[PDB]
């Protein structure tokens, strides 16, 4: 549904209901609780002040009661993987096993890594537990922690990127876009008597915080829904603003000068190396799994050059036409490279983005399968471009 | 567009389409048209008339025959013609062009249009040019058409190797088996005939495929009649898949065609580059070149440009509909526009529009949807050299 897409990177993993010799994987953690109480506290603070001064409507009184309930239910759960998130990983693992049982048979060896963040470790474990229940004779190497920061949390390690993310030139563009797209008064009219008395700044922060609470609720497995606080057109506009925020701060927006994308090259390098070692026999893993974050997936996909995902759109109002974050990095977003060897020992690779075949701007006579030689050369050119970009910052 | 509209494939009507360039380079298919051939209508009519003569029609069959007889009257004399809708489609494309780029077509701007010899393409050109001239009568206009342009607009009739492939190439066994798998005629015939069993599978499938064809073209004719509800949405979906596959295999980048259907379009791509180079160099003073032709012109031209999606090579026939959609490439009035811009540094940019939406090429640009013309030209020249190499094998 359009409403689910307008949750953007908070969208739940979508519904997804001859044999490769290797699978190379990167997956975001599954659906999670909100990481921060900031938006909830802001909504609550506004409605409480209104209640003190007799300023709430009937529905604002009901919203306040509901916000108070969510505050209690979110307490001690911030950033945790939800039941839905566990179920999402079990589905991804389960389909992979169902689709390629030969690959995971007969004491096959798999390795999984995760970041130090608990929701990513727990996503790894839900995935691996499914793997093991299906074939307990798998050999399994499991590790996680800050030792993987350079390939899984590179967005925390590059000084120029951190500065850009915190105070770079994309910020004024985003804020002007929000002011253009989001009209706070009609939304607040639903909840507050005399909403025109609120300054535009506080009105905007209230509404954006409320959208944030509503957008994450379907990821929590809590049986409550707030999608009807906003019309479909209001969700559409909210999504356009958050989509633009993700694009400019994490992807290939001209304002970022490809800095957000270039920082991902160590992960693309490690992907190529693990595949080359398996192909050569230096490694005999049947799969490498990696569990991380939207901030890992988004630039990695752009650096691979998956078609659409690395477009450089110069007009901010055109971004949503050409680049759609809910297609790139929903909850549990994942990239899988599937390697095949044909009868003449040639190596083919299929790229799956959220379990659907993805296109690269190189030729192939057998789409969705690409020549690995051609693909690796292409990816190496992308890494070299990334290194050149970083040499200027 | 609704699903039922998309399932009309290349018979889908042009979709709804409700800083200054110095040149526009255009190719357009004719607008919505009448059926070119009475074969399908006659096959449907002869089966229904013959069953009626032996009292073999259901009530729904009788209603369908009454409708088929009206269509035969209304199609009479009109075969192949541009319809009123086809005219309004061209007026909309020209009108939106004029509104989007008014400075290009102001004062005494010079434009040239060509068309094939086929009347619906000539009439589409004239619908388009009348809009131009009515908006600005001070335009200078050069108008021409005919078989003299077959080499760039109907190259699909001129290449012996391609004509042989189109008529008796290796794609036909694939297409016929795909139709047999996808189309079950018996449920449809039970709707209209008492005892569909007395028909062989061969004639039953011919009847159903003809009825689909009659129903698919009707929205293009401006006749206030409609036959979509003769079929379920799933039946339309399967019919569209078979016709999409036929277009892909006989006209585009299917592996079974070995790029022969696409390579034949290189004279038209070369002529696009020539007319823009002559304007950039000053040899030519035109502000636009317009060209009116056919789906068989547009489909391989788009694939030879390498517009993303449109040149995919899919070996599994069942996967084609997932990755290649003929209603997105060549609906009625399908058109390609190249818009050329000169920035403050005298650099040439080009924007490629497919059916008035920005198209992507597999080359990089820091200002999508605008590409460097130098980079684009070099890429297009590489596409032409590939095409010539493909043709030397045939
Ligand atoms: O720890 P935080 O400072 O709160 O950062 C989180 C987190 O970023 P990191 O995990 O990389 O540190 C989320 O990324 P995920 O782990 O969920 O993949 C991101 O989620 P989105 O990518 O969907 O934006 C979220 O944003 P939000 O709080 O709006 O949900 C963002 O929090 P901040 O927006 O405050 O940076
Ligand atoms: O069914 P298709 O003819 O293949 O078109 C689909 C359809 O777009 P429209 O129905 O509006 O024409 C999708 O809508 P959904 O069914 O997924 O809801 C849309 O997805 P978005 O609206 O999210 O853009 C998607 O576009 P996309 O390329 O982003 O997948 C696009 O597919 P294509 O245009 O690529 O064929
Ligand atoms: O007149 P025909 O020799 O029978 O060919 C026509 C015609 O092809 P050409 O005009 O290029 O020769 C149509 O193309 P358009 O002029 O309409 O653009 C095409 O239409 P489609 O591309 O939509 O298939 C049509 O097919 P149909 O009769 O099923 O509508 C096709 O007839 P053929 O089946 O003989 O190719």
Distance CA B165, CA B162 (A): 5
Q: Determine phi and psi for B259, rounding to 5 degrees.
A: 65, 0
Distance CA B236, CA B246 (A): 15
Query: Of A321, A361, A366, which has the smallest distance from its Cβ to B313's Cβ?
Result: A366
Name residue, tokens 């032996």: B54
Distance CA A170, CA A255 (A): 6
Beta bridge partners of A349: A339, A370
* Distance set, CA B177 to CA A110, B157, B184, B210, B213 (Å): 42, 26, 12, 17, 19
Chain A nearest-CA distance from B363, in A, is: 8
How far, in Å, is the centroid of ligand 1 from the Cα of A352?
24
Distance CA B349, CA B368 (A): 10
In this structure, what DSSP letter does residue A308 have? T
Give the mutation target among B9, B167, B291, B296 for probing the ligand 3 site: most ligand atoms within 8 A of CB: B296
C-alpha torsion sign, points A192, A196, A197, A198:
positive
Pocket lined around ligand 2, Cβ cut-off 6 Å: A 5, 324, 327; B 1, 6, 325, 328
Residue B255 contacts by C-beta under 8 Å, 6 or more apart in sequence?
A: A365, A366, B313, B314, B315
Beta bridge partners of A348: A340, A371
Q: Which atom of ligand 3 is nearest to the CA of B157?
A: 12
Domain A1-393 has CATH 3.40.50.1240: yes
> Are A109 and A71 a contacting pair, CB within 8 Å?
no
Q: Report how far Cα B259 is from the mean position of its chain's Cα atoms.
A: 19
Other C-beta atoms within 10 Å of B358: how many? 16
Which residue CA neighbors atom 2 of ligand 3 most closely?
B36
Cα–Cα nearest to A302, from A340, A358, A373: A358
Max Cα-Cα span within chain A: 79
Q: Which atom of ligand 3 is nearest to the CA of B120?
A: 16
- DSSP helix/strand/coil, A203: helix
Please, where are the H alpha helices in chain B?
A: 3-6, 39-53, 59-75, 84-100, 119-135, 150-153, 160-168, 171-182, 185-192, 201-217, 233-251, 260-263, 266-281, 295-305, 320-323, 326-329, 373-393
Beta bridge partners of A81: A32
C-alpha torsion sign, points B335, B341, B347, B351:
negative
Q: Where are the domains of chain B?
A: 1-394
Q: Report how far Cα B200 is from the mean position of its chain's Cα atoms.
A: 34
**Burial of A341 from C-beta contacts in 10 A (0-12 / 13-18 / 19+):** middle
Chain A nearest-CA distance from B159, in A, is: 23
The answer to whether A307 contacts B312, with C-beta atoms less than 8 Å apart, is no
Ligand index nearest the alpha carbon of residue B8: 3
Q: Report how far Cα A118 is from the mean position of its chain's Cα atoms.
A: 16
Indicate the length of chain A as a whole number.
393
- DSSP helix/strand/coil, B314: strand
Other C-beta atoms within 10 Å of A68: how many? 14
B369 upstream amide cis, omega within 30 of 0: yes
* Distance set, CA B243 to CA A146, B307, B324, B325, B367 (Å): 55, 21, 12, 10, 37
Rg of chain B over Cα atoms, rounded to whole angstroms, equals 22
The string of DSSP codes covering B134-155 is: HH-TT-EEEEEESGGGHHHH-G
> Are B233 and B355 a contacting pair, CB within 8 Å?
no
Max Cα-Cα span within chain B: 79
Q: Determine phi and psi for A204, rounding to 5 degrees.
A: -65, -45
C-alpha torsion sign, points B256, B260, B263, B267:
negative
Distance CA A333, CA A16 (A): 12
Cα–Cα nearest to B25, from B307, B350, B266, B346: B350
Give the mutation target among A306, A327, A330, A359 for probing the ligand 2 site: most ligand atoms within 8 A of CB: A327
Residue A67 contacts by C-beta under 8 Å, 6 or more apart in sequence?
A: A40, A43, A44, A47, A213
Ligand index nearest the alpha carbon of residue A211: 1
Report the phi/psi class of residue B146: left, alpha or beta, with left for phi > 0 and alpha for psi in -120 to 50: left
CA atoms within 13 A on the CB side of A51: 14
Q: Which two tokens stand for residue A239?
A: 């999504």
The answer to whether A359 contacts B308, with C-beta atoms less than 8 Å apart, is yes
**Burial of B72 from C-beta contacts in 10 A (0-12 / 13-18 / 19+):** middle
Which residue CA neighbors atom 19 of ligand 3 most closely?
B295
Q: What is the dihedral of CA A351, A359, A291, A275, to 10 degrees?
A: 40
Cα–Cα nearest to B23, from B271, B268, B269, B285: B285
Ligand index nearest the alpha carbon of residue B120: 3
Annotated binding site of B for 1D-myo-inositol hexakisphosphate: 6, 10, 29-30, 33, 36, 120, 154, 247, 294-295, 309, 327
> Are B101 and B135 a contacting pair, CB within 8 Å?
no
Q: Report how far Cα A43 is from the mean position of its chain's Cα atoms.
A: 25
Residue B365 contacts by C-beta under 8 Å, 6 or more apart in sequence?
A: A312, B371, B372, B375
* Distance set, CA A253 to CA A261, A291, B295, B302, B319 (Å): 9, 26, 36, 28, 33
> Are B112 and B25 a contacting pair, CB within 8 Å?
no
Q: Which two tokens stand for residue B257?
A: 């065609």
B295 lines ligand 3 (CB under 6 A): yes
Query: N- to C-terminal Cα distance for chain A?
Result: 41
**Burial of A190 from C-beta contacts in 10 A (0-12 / 13-18 / 19+):** middle
Distance CA A327, CA A260 (A): 19
**Burial of B294 from C-beta contacts in 10 A (0-12 / 13-18 / 19+):** buried
Give the mutation target among B12, B36, B118 for probing the ligand 3 site: most ligand atoms within 8 A of CB: B36
Query: Of A254, A362, A366, which has the smallest distance from its Cβ to B315's Cβ?
Result: A366
Q: Which two tokens stand for residue B171?
A: 């794609």
The answer to whether B360 contacts A311, with C-beta atoms less than 8 Å apart, is yes
Q: Report the DSSP pairing between strands B110-115 and B23-29.
A: unpaired
Report the phi/psi class of residue A349: left, alpha or beta, with left for phi > 0 and alpha for psi in -120 to 50: beta
Q: Report the DSSP pairing between strands B348-354 and B370-372.
A: antiparallel
B11 lines ligand 3 (CB under 6 A): yes
Ligand index nearest the alpha carbon of residue B300: 3
Beta bridge partners of B115: B145, B292
B335 lines ligand 3 (CB under 6 A): no
Which residue CA neighbors atom 31 of ligand 2 most closely?
B328
Q: Which atom of ligand 2 is nearest to the CA of B1?
A: 12
Buried b (16+ CB within 10 A) or exposed e, B176-204: eebbeebbebeebbeebbeebeebeeeeb
In this structure, what DSSP letter does residue B13 have? P
CA atoms within 13 A on the CB side of A260: 29
Distance CA A205, CA A184 (A): 9
Interface test with B, best of A311, A367, A369, A370 (most B CBs within 10 A): A367
Beta bridge partners of B23: B340
Query: Of A313, A357, A364, which has the smallest distance from its Cβ to B313's Cβ?
Result: A364
Distance CA A314, CA A64 (A): 41
Q: Which two tokens stand for residue A140?
A: 């399994």
Beta bridge partners of B145: B115
Write the class of the CATH domain B1-394: alpha beta
The string of DSSP codes covering A119-166 is: HHHHHHHHHHHHHHHH-TT-EEEEEESGGGHHHH-GGGT-HHHHHHHH
Q: Which two tokens stand for residue A59?
A: 């529905």
Query: Of B255, B308, B370, which has the smallest distance from its Cβ to A365's Cβ?
Result: B255
Q: What is the dihedral of CA B379, B381, B386, B387, to 10 degrees?
A: 120
A362 contacts in chain B (CB < 8 Å): 362
Other C-beta atoms within 10 Å of A64: how many? 19
Q: Which two tokens stand for residue A324?
A: 């759609």
Report the phi/psi class of residue B90: left, alpha or beta, with left for phi > 0 and alpha for psi in -120 to 50: alpha
Distance CA A153, CA A147 (A): 10
- DSSP helix/strand/coil, B358: strand
A253 contacts in chain B (CB < 8 Å): none
- DSSP helix/strand/coil, A311: coil
Secondary structure element (H or E) that encloses residue A340, with its range: strand A334-341
Q: Determine phi and psi for A128, rounding to 5 degrees.
A: -65, -40
* Distance set, CA B112 to CA B120, B132, B145 (Å): 18, 11, 11
Residue A336 contacts by C-beta under 8 Å, 6 or more apart in sequence?
A: A23, A24, A25, A96, A351, A352, A355
How far, in Å, is the centroid of ligand 1 from the Cα of A302?
19
Q: What is the dihedral of CA A30, A35, A39, A40, to 10 degrees?
A: 90
Distance CA B292, CA A5 (A): 40
* Distance set, CA A354 to CA A16, A340, B384 (Å): 9, 19, 36
Indicate the length of chain B as a whole number.
394
The answer to whether A361 contacts B308, with C-beta atoms less than 8 Å apart, is yes
Q: Which two tokens stand for residue A290?
A: 């990696």
The answer to whether A367 contacts B308, with C-beta atoms less than 8 Å apart, is no
Beta bridge partners of B368: A313
> Are B104 and B112 a contacting pair, CB within 8 Å?
no
* Distance set, CA B111 to CA A66, A253, B55, B271, B287 (Å): 65, 37, 61, 16, 6
Residue B201 contacts by C-beta under 8 Å, 6 or more apart in sequence?
A: B185
């Amino acid at each position: 549904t359009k409403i689910q897409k307008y949750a953007g990177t908070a969208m739940p993993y979508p519904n997804r209901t001859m044999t490769p010799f290797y699978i190379n994987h990167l997956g975001r953690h599954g659906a999670r609780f909100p990481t921060s109480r900031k938006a909830l506290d802001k909504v609550e603070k506004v409605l409480v002040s209104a209640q003190q001064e007799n300023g709430l409507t009937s529905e604002g009184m009901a919203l306040l009661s509901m916000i108070r309930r969510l505050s209690r239910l979110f307490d001690g759960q911030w950033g945790k993987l939800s039941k839905l998130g566990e179920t999402e990983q079990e589905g991804i693992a389960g389909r992979m096993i169902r689709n390629y049982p030969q690959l995971f048979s007969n004491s096959a060896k798999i390795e999984a890594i995760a970041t130090y963040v608990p929701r990513s470790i727990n996503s790894m474990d839900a995935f691996l537990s499914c793997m093991i229940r299906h074939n307990p004779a798998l050999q399994v190497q499991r590790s996680e922690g800050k030792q993987y920061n350079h390939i899984l949390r590179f967005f925390d390690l590059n000084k120029s990127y951190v500065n850009y993310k915190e105070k770079g030139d994309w910020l004024p563009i985003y804020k002007a876009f929000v002011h253009k797209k989001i009209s706070p008064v009609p939304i607040m009219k639903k909840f507050l008597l005399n909403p025109e008395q609120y300054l535009d700044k506080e009105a905007e922060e209230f509404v954006m915080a409320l959208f944030s609470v509503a957008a994450i609720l379907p990821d929590t497995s809590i049986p409550l829904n707030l999608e009807d606080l906003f019309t479909l057109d209001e969700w559409h506009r909210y999504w356009q603003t958050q989509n633009l925020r993700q694009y400019m701060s994490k992807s290939s927006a001209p304002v970022g000068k490809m800095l957000p994308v270039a920082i991902a090259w160590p992960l693309l390098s490690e992907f190529i190396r693990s595949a080359q070692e398996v192909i050569s026999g230096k490694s005999d893993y049947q799969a490498n799994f990696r569990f991380a974050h939207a901030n890992t997936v988004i630039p990695f996909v752009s650096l691979m050059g998956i078609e659409k995902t690395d477009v450089q759109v110069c007009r901010p109002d055109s971004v949503s036409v050409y680049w759609k974050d809910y297609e790139i990095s929903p909850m549990a977003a994942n990239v899988q490279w599937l390697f095949y060897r044909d009868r003449d020992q040639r190596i083919w690779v299929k790229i799956l983005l959220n379990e659907e075949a993805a296109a690269l701007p190189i030729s192939t006579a057998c789409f969705p399968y690409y020549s690995w030689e051609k693909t690796r050369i292409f990816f190496n050119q992308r890494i070299e471009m990334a290194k050149k970009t970083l040499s200027v910052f």
